[PDB]
Amino acid sequence: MRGQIRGLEMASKNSQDGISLIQTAEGALTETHAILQRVRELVVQAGNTGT
Amino acid sequence: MRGQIRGLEMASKNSQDGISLIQTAEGALTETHAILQRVRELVVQAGNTGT
């Protein structure tokens, strides 16, 4: 019992920390995304400016 | 969504600037036109002056 219980608590802890990891990753991807949006803007403008 | 939206705004911007271009062009053509009218006048006069 106490084995499964203690390791369970550590498993939920582990889980919340895994969450935090992927939140960091996805925040980096939020700014990645922001830049790519900006690139798209610059390509639209680029397409008009091509002539 | 935000992709299409931002690029849309830039597309309307692009459009107004294309308008401004063709307005410049057509203003040059307005003065072009003015001169050609003047030439026509000079040809009419030329036709009388031919004799």
Side-chain angles (χ1 to χ4, degrees), chain B residues 22-36:
Chain B
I22 62 169
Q23 293 186 0
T24 300
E26 191 271 330
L29 296 174
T30 301
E31 293 295 327
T32 301
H33 182 74
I35 296 169
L36 294 174

Side-chain angles (χ1 to χ4, degrees), chain A residues 5-23:
Chain A
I5 296 168
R6 293 181 184 272
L8 187 152
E9 183 65 26
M10 296 298 102
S12 65
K13 184 176 180 180
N14 285 316
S15 296
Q16 294 182 359
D17 298 329
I19 295 170
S20 293
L21 188 151
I22 61 169
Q23 293 186 0

Side-chain angles (χ1 to χ4, degrees), chain A residues 33 37 40-41 44-45 48 51, chain B residues 2-4 6-7 10 13-14:
Chain A
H33 182 74
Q37 296 292 315
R40 184 176 181 272
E41 293 180 350
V44 175
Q45 293 181 358
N48 192 9
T51 62
Chain B
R2 292 189 296 273
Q4 184 182 8
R6 293 181 184 272
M10 296 298 102
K13 184 176 180 180
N14 285 316

Side-chain angles (χ1 to χ4, degrees), chain B residues 37-50:
Chain B
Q37 296 292 315
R38 181 66 178 172
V39 176
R40 184 176 181 272
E41 293 180 350
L42 295 173
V43 175
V44 175
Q45 293 181 358
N48 192 9
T49 58

